[PDB]
Write an enzyme that holds these catalytic residues in place. Sequence first.
Site, short mmCIF file in Angstrom:
data_model
loop_
_atom_site.label_atom_id
_atom_site.label_comp_id
_atom_site.label_asym_id
_atom_site.label_seq_id
_atom_site.Cartn_x
_atom_site.Cartn_y
_atom_site.Cartn_z
N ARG A 32 0.82 -1.21 0.00
CA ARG A 32 0.00 0.00 0.00
C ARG A 32 0.86 1.26 0.00
O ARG A 32 1.74 1.43 0.85
CB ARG A 32 -0.96 -0.01 1.20
CG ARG A 32 -1.70 1.30 1.44
CD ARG A 32 -2.57 1.17 2.66
NE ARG A 32 -3.28 2.41 2.99
CZ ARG A 32 -2.99 3.20 4.02
NH1 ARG A 32 -2.00 2.89 4.85
NH2 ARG A 32 -3.70 4.30 4.23
N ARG B 102 -5.57 18.65 7.81
CA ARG B 102 -4.35 18.50 8.60
C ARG B 102 -3.92 19.82 9.24
O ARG B 102 -4.25 20.90 8.75
CB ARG B 102 -3.21 17.92 7.76
CG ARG B 102 -3.59 16.65 6.98
CD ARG B 102 -2.37 15.85 6.57
NE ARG B 102 -1.81 15.13 7.71
CZ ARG B 102 -2.05 13.86 8.00
NH1 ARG B 102 -2.84 13.12 7.23
NH2 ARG B 102 -1.48 13.31 9.07
N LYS C 229 -13.11 3.24 0.71
CA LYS C 229 -12.85 3.29 2.14
C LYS C 229 -14.04 3.90 2.86
O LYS C 229 -14.44 5.03 2.57
CB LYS C 229 -11.58 4.09 2.43
CG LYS C 229 -10.30 3.41 1.97
CD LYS C 229 -9.11 4.36 1.95
CE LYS C 229 -8.68 4.77 3.35
NZ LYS C 229 -7.42 5.56 3.31
N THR D 249 -6.25 -0.77 10.01
CA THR D 249 -5.88 0.26 10.99
C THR D 249 -5.83 -0.22 12.44
O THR D 249 -6.81 -0.73 12.98
CB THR D 249 -6.74 1.55 10.87
OG1 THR D 249 -6.85 1.92 9.50
CG2 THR D 249 -6.11 2.69 11.65
#
Lengths: 502, 501, 506, 500
Positions: B43, B90, B240, B298
């Site tokens: 990934r 972010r 996702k 995760t």
Amino acid sequence: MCRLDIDSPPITARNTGIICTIGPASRSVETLKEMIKSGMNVARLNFSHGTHEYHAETIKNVRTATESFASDPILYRPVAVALDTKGPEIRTGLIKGSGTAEVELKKGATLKITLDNAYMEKCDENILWLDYKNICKVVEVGSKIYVDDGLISLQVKQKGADFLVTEVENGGSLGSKKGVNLPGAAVDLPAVSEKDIQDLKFGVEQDVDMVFASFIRKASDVHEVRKVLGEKGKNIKIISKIENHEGVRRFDEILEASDGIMVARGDLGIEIPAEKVFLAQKMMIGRCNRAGKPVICATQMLESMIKKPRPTRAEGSDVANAVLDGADCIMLSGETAKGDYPLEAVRMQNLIAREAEAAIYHLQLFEELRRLAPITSDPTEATAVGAVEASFKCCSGAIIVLTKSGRSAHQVARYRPRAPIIAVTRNPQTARQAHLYRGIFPVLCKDPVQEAWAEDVDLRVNFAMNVGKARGFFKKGDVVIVLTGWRPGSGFTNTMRVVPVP
Amino acid sequence: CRLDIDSPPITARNTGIICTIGPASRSVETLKEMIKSGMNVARLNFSHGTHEYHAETIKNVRTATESFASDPILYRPVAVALDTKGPEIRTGLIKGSGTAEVELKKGATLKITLDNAYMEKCDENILWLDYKNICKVVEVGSKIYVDDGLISLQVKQKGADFLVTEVENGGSLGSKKGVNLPGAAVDLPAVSEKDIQDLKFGVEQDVDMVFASFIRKASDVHEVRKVLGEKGKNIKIISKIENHEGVRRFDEILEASDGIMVARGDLGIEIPAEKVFLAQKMMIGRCNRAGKPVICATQMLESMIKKPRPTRAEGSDVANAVLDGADCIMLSGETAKGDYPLEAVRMQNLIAREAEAAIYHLQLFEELRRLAPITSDPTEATAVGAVEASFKCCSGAIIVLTKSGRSAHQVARYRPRAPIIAVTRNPQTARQAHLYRGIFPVLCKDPVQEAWAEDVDLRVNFAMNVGKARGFFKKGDVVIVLTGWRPGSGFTNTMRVVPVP
Amino acid sequence: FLEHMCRLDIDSPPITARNTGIICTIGPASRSVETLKEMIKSGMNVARLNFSHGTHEYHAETIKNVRTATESFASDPILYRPVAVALDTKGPEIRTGLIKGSGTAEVELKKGATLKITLDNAYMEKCDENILWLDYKNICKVVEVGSKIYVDDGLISLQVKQKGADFLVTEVENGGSLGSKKGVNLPGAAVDLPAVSEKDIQDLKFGVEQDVDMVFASFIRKASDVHEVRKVLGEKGKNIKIISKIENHEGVRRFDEILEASDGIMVARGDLGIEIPAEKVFLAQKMMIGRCNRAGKPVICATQMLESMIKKPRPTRAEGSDVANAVLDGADCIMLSGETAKGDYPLEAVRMQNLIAREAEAAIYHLQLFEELRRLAPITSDPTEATAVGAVEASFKCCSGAIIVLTKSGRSAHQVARYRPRAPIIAVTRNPQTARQAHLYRGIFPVLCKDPVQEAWAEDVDLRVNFAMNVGKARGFFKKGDVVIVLTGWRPGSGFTNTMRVVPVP
Amino acid sequence: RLDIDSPPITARNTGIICTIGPASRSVETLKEMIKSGMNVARLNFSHGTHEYHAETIKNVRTATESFASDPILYRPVAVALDTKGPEIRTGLIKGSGTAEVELKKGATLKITLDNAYMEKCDENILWLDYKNICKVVEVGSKIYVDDGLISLQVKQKGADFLVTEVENGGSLGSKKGVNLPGAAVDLPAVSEKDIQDLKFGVEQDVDMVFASFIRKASDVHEVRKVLGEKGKNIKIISKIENHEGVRRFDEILEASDGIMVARGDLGIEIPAEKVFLAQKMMIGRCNRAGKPVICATQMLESMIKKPRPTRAEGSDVANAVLDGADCIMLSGETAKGDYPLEAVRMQNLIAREAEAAIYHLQLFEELRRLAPITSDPTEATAVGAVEASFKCCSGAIIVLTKSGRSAHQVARYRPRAPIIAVTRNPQTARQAHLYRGIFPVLCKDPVQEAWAEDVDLRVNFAMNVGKARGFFKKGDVVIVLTGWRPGSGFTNTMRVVPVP
Ligand SMILES: O=P(O)(O)OC[C@H]1O[C@](O)(COP(=O)(O)O)[C@@H](O)[C@@H]1O
Ligand SMILES: O=C([O-])C(=O)[O-]
Ligand SMILES: O=C([O-])C(=O)[O-]
Ligand SMILES: O=C([O-])C(=O)[O-]
Ligand SMILES: [Mg+2]
């Protein structure tokens, strides 16, 4: 699986018990009050750490915090007190003369292990004392020695006369009185040592509800613990901790001899391969559910919450899956004992368990536990299974059970009803011990024993009705199941009534 | 009750392992060991790094992978996955002065600004973030989460282009950390200009799949599909699910997508953490029923970033994910930046193997076969016939010849215990096969024979040789072989039960 | 099951061809070529010859007539229906003689009247309402005064009033019609008859000579009884199927070892209903059928299924229910005795059994029956068994019109039949015996290929598959667009079936 | 796995309904009927006068009350009235010639409506009592006579006559039943005779009505209206015996107290091969609804002339019980046959065997699953009682009941243990036989002053009954169902108690 609604809220009634280890971070009266409000049902005291005086002061604090809610018996929550034994174990000494102090270990650094009793309270990054005197005869040049639930690994470089010189294979924090594990090796340690006897006798004096017996390897180990508790501690529940290969292979005979089981994954996860723990856990929980004996899933459930206010996704998963497996109780160790967020840890366990119980499809679980459960002549057993079946039928708001020893409520709980089991007792120990069984809500009645027995029954039933109303289990129009006997005394529960809430 | 611990599992591991690449696993030497340990998919995380960086990563991944090409029998195909940035929020950089991380204590006041003058001057008093329209979507009382949801802030005063917050959950604040806004409707594009640039790069660099971040609806998937275009139409889109809307509209997302990732990192912040297991189990079940790849991701082995051994919660999490029915499991920081990346991969191989041996395979197939609707499709009929036969004769394998993968996928849908050895000449098909539980892809490089019947048995014998070398079966054993009646895709109709030569 | 029980619809017509085999007993009422032709058209699959009655000449002529009728349809192999021939042995039984020298003649016995049982051989073809002859010479030792003697499956009860040395005098406790050579039962009494008698040896020898497909072995009591019939038939009759008839207490009690030794079972209710308490027969029937289903061996439900149809053109409600429930139990075959042998309505009886069985088959939840027979099916190493299970599962998946099986001995087709697919099993064979014996297996539609073997084996396989395809289209199993399952092998011979193909119909 | 060497328990659950006629009408024979296991006496109102049936009821009661001196052993016997309904019947065969006429296949037969021929029927000419037959029939229509054994086909249709061809021949006697499948028979659902007969039933205090040829819910309501308030407690059991009855089953069942699968007429009105489907469907739906279902007609038909049944009949009776039928019935077997007692005894033996064959837990699991979640406390208590009865292998479930209702609620979940229903209502005791597994016992003791002791008195009475009948002994465990106050609708208490 496919029809699981995430936008669907669950009830306020949490069925899984929360066991909290009480230490330096959660010892004060004010903290313990908030612990109970957060949903602590059992206080675990770890006798691998601290002194008798230390634990006695903690027990006092637990009771002081518990009894501050005693003025309102309707909303009063009983809190159990549990004694966790040392058992046949190898432990380290005190770091820098403290039970709290920690030293950072560097990978590749040298560490000497001594057997000298003078260094038992002067452990640091250079020297570490151990309580196992026969350690030099069981290790090889290159043997691996694990410390603190396997956290730190140590390879033997030098094997001296009264010492061992090792290299740190991985870094991490080393605290006081940490467990040492030697997989494969044979330890001559007794099931119940002299220290174990004194600790067990201390528990009898302190009036504990249950004993968590460390490193139970066979059935005779359980009998030894029970013999030491004797006739004075005959009502103290013995929960056998399965934390090694020997206890797993002889699980059947241990379960038979014990009042319950704890899956002690901390030690177990180094004693057996870490990838096999989930198998042992699911095997043990299933067999305990089948036998109708309490099972506790324990250790590292929310491990990252020692340092952090929120759990990892793996930790959320772990708690949930333990409940889905069928665990009666979930446990917090360091998360409440020494961590920075003990309240958050308990609160997270309340929330996850509550969600997991809503996920469990109760009918399929009951139907399986039904046909698997054997035919018996016992009247209380038949009344219990008849009540659980009736609860599913009329979507009852509760199952009210009057019980002196707990037994009647335990027999209802083993068939896993959706309805909460309100166990009304006058026995304080019974109310505390009821927390070991999934879905039991113990209530302590302190109303004086009424002149006419029929009126003493009705009063206790009415007391449960008031508890259910205030806590929010049911309201006026609701249908509930009431279990009683035909005479006073244990072992006479034979009556089931379908009654409306007054 | 009947679960055996002291009974070791079988050779083959069915559940695919996805590893995020970064500083700790980027070199050719390390990547070789990753593949040895069990890595099936690499990934690439496009929240960080330039195109040059990722092109070098892919180059290294392919060098390590093709070093095993000298032996086509033991060669293991490794897929390459592109994980998009998506509508991410972010923070900026902590100011040069002070410490690397600023301490945010509970009860303290923090100012959130959009003034670029403070974009590299963050501290305990002032915090910058890159979402321009934050004030438009949040209100007084809204919760703001920073750094994997460890920091929590509540809006006290909503300014014109700023926010005055109270610190609720404390901790250390570092540089460029992720920000979540649960309840608020973030108006960032589903596919940004950067996302378009990255998706095009993925097509040009010939990636096998896309992990599309923050998919909220079906039209989000279509946008991604359009950007990949005609040249990248064989690239699998994995959507996702990591927000509330992604869960609400899951059914239309799954339909539009080639597969799903349960992205629990962001998901566990966007919705309550106690609800993630419900969402995970709902999605895995629905994907299994739909015959579509599902990845659990995760924090599966978080502590293994710093420790050589996982926590008991992590050991349980990996196993339960396999038991739930996940086609793939994933590592992020454990392989990207952690101190023990190879130990993380090895631990997943071990746990997955144990969990697969624990699965009551016959009951699972029975539940999936009953829920599978009737169709006149010959390949579907052959697939169910094969799986049924494999349970009856305890076969060592189900050999499947496939060009696009579909035939092998159809068999995987019904979850046999026997490993599915998919023989193919298509290199991309062999890579993408790792998204499907139980498929062991083998790449046939042999020249195509003039006679079609002889070409088939050449590829069948290649499967016999792979199975014997990897310990799937022996000469005495019997296996199931799935083939077709004519060349080209969509013609698999033949099931044969043959012994091993 | 209860949820599905409520959903049964009489307005829903059966659109599928009948799976359960129909066995008819051939006697005076159905002996002619004309009648036998109509019976095959009505649905007869197996002709049963009862060797307790008639002679070798009588049965040889009957077999001849069966074959004449059967081969009258042979001109067109596509529509041709194979018809099996079954020999039903005497066994360790006790039987009466001939009434007035005729195998058809009857006498009316009246309640209260006296009847003499003689052992004198001068009366063996001269039985009437006063004198009755039996072949059991040791009857005077096993019987006492007060004992009850049942004649013809318990139709007539007699009580012993006076016991002699070579004669018994009885009283008729209930009236009814007495015919020739009828069964005599003495429940609880210890008979000392051999497993294979002198007469049985001659009959089995006759059975081999006449090329019969199967033997219905009467009064099988134990496993060594079956082995004895197997040995007597020997290498010459090694391909002849032995169907053990369960007719007494010992047969039920030792069923497991009997089933293991046999090729199939018949629940012979006539004698069983009198040997054991009548109220216990249904248990025996259901137990035995279930065990045969689970073992994958043929089971036949027999006797008095449409008993009233001997004299009447329509069955009782009980009889209608009996056939249906036999099929729902899991019987591979249903049987007619007197209804076809001596009755006034032999054609109506066969037709009615076709109608009920087809209705009952539509009622069977094949999804559940297959689920149970598959879960309880043991792990095998045989590729033919695995291909069979795969084919059946695939057939439920693509709702096939048929499962086409190429088979030499029948085994491959039989292995498919035991997992009970809904789709009809078209067993294509060049072996005539295999085509006939396949009728013992539920769902198998045997088709005989007359075509010469092609040089190319692959083209010989394709010819047989296409021949099955022609049959299916002609009989209405499927159309052109439909999907079918075809089972074949990899090489010539027996025991090589390993290939399943899901192909469209040409 | 089923084993024949395993002996069944003493308790027989499936009720036995016997049709009374010339072969079983005497007090002496009826006493034997009861001892052999007759639970319900069926009166067929297609034949006989009110005078006749009144004497029958008198005999049945005399025979029943001969055992009344011992309440511990006394078995309640119900009386059922079976209406004539919209029947079509032929006339009498003429005096000259043989008593029955042979009809041959292919021969021509004339059907008349001329009353001059109503007692002069023969092989050439036949009369019937349905005056509007020609209006509802066409050329090609099939007419069936005498239990469907004779079949005719219309070739010519006049104003008040018919010319037919005989398809299935046979022997024709007098006053034989006629069926017209696929015809819209316009005869009244409840005729003037039917009204008279139903009013008579109320007067004679009958327990239940078997209503013939019910096609729809409105037919049931008509019967309900005739019985009125005076006979409101009389149970209506709708007979399903035609195609419209099957098609409109759900509304019929909803309106009725129970169902009879009347297979005689049903097997003529619909194809014979489809009767088993209709039976299994209707029984399942009745089981699902908790309402009594009777399987009827030709169950042991050969036992009219023979002392032992056929193998088909043996299985039929067993499969009826295995299907889930509450009651099984005998018609000509007990009414006119040569072996009425043997027919009753045979049904007792097969039913007891079939009940031992039932996997009760699996059946209860499905019955509970398909049952809705209700607020009804009695419903919940019943489900708890059946569950508890499986867990402790109880000898019995004792239920105190006034209207029967409480015992009925237990019976629908099909416990293995016999349900001893204690009642003081004699009608409740008789009607309880319609429900599988209920053993009604009539307490005749005076109402005790203290209510708690009056309950205990009835509970102890049930203990004594179970002991005498051999259901359980002193060491055994039983389930006891009682209520919180006197009167119907208050059952809420389950006790698990040892036998005194
Ligand atoms: O799964 P896919 O894409 O349909 O591929 C399976 C195909 O492989 C085959 O076995 C061989 O086809 P090729 O000659 O193209 O390789 C076909 O019969 C079948 O259609
Ligand atoms: O002791 C414990 O709890 C453990 O080892 O997990
Ligand atoms: O992006 C992810 O994978 C996540 O948030 O879990
Ligand atoms: O022989 C038989 O078939 C019988 O007795 O039923
Ligand atoms: Mg994310």
